[PDB]
Structures are given as C-alpha cells and as structure tokens.
Ligand binder design. Structure first.
Ligand SMILES: *CC(=O)N1Cc2[nH]c3ccccc3c2C[C@H]1C(=O)N1CCCC[C@H]1C(=O)N[C@@H](Cc1c[nH]c2ccc(F)cc12)C(N)=O
Length: 145
C-alpha cells in the first residue's frame, strides 16, 4: 500500500475500505514522492486558532468541534458533487487564499507547516485530504499538481 494507507472495515456495512492516517482521506477503492506539489486548501478557523480572525469574521468564536463539523460537511458536499472545492473555498475559507479559490501555488518540502506539508506530499494528483489540523485551524487540501 502507498505511503500512509491502511485497510479497515466499515462500521455500518462491514465492507472493506482504505484510510490514510497522514491525509485523513478515506475511500472504498484500493489506492494506487515528487519534488514539488501544488495545492489548494479550505481553512476553517476556531476559537483556539493562533489568530482567530479572518476576512469572514473579525472575531472567530466557533469551537474546534464546530469547525470540524463544518469541515466534515464541506467534504460531504464536495464528494457528492453538490458543491465543488474551489467554490466552497472562495466562499468559506478563513484565509486570504480564498480570493484565489484556495490555490497556494507550488511548494517543496521545507516551506509549509509539517502537518500540511506531510498531507500535501502524500496526496495523489487530484486527490483531496480529510481534515488536516494546524495551529491556524482545520484544512481540506486538494492536490492539483
Ligand atoms: C490562510 C493560510 O493558511 N495562509 C495564507 C495564505 N494566503 C496565500 C495566498 C497565496 C499563496 C499562499 C498563501 C498563504 C499561506 C497560508 C498559511 O499561512 N499556511 C499554508 C497552509 C498551511 C499552514 C500555513 C503555513 O504553513 N505557512 C507557512 C508560511 C507561508 C506564508 N505564506 C506562504 C506562501 C507559500 C509558502 F510556501 C509558505 C508560506 C509556514 N508557517 O511555514
């Protein structure tokens, strides 16, 4: 299995699935390192963020648990096709990158905070992470290159 992936059993159905502890991604199908990657992200901040403030809200008051619920909801809508990642990032990401539909550009290792970097370089091109925690809040990451 590729880096970070493990086989697991669904609680509701008992069917095998696959989970990546680095990206917190999960998928039913059996999954299939570059010097640089390009990623977009959607950040949801919370009251314990290092700077609980964004262009959306001067004082961010939601709890970390409420932020995780929002992230889970965005992931659901992206995976169902009801919304696309870029549209949700433009509207709801607590970050100046929202104006660029979440695009952070390309980077190598040594530039991003390690949890974000590790998830970014463990994703396949076009793959999306689960919730990824940094001191600023909770991210969804989309590897675009
Ligand atoms: C909101 C947020 O998470 N930002 C703000 C931001 N807006 C951008 C617009 C265009 C390109 C890059 C942008 C960023 C950077 C980002 C941020 O603070 N991040 C990125 C996601 C993980 C956590 C955190 C960091 O890891 N920041 C870097 C320092 C840093 C700041 N700006 C950049 C740009 C590129 C880069 F490679 C690194 C950057 C860190 N703490 O090491």
């Amino acid at each position: 299995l590729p880096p970070g992936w493990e086989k697991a059993m669904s609680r509701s159905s008992g069917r095998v699935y696959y989970f990546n502890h680095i990206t917190n991604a999960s998928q039913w199908e059996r999954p299939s390192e570059p010097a640089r990657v390009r990623c977009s992200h959607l950040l949801v901040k919370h009251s314990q963020s290092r700077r609980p403030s964004s262009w959306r809200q001067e004082k961010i008051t939601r709890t970390k648990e409420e932020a995780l619920e929002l992230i889970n909801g965005y992931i659901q809508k992206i995976k169902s096709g009801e919304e696309d990642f870029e549209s949700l990032a433009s509207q709801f990401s607590d970050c100046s990158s929202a104006k660029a539909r979440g695009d952070l550009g390309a980077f190598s290792r040594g530039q991003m905070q390690k949890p974000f970097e590790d998830a970014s370089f463990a994703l396949r091109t076009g793959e999306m992470s689960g919730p990824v925690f940094t001191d600023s809040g909770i991210h969804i990451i989309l590897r675009t290159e």
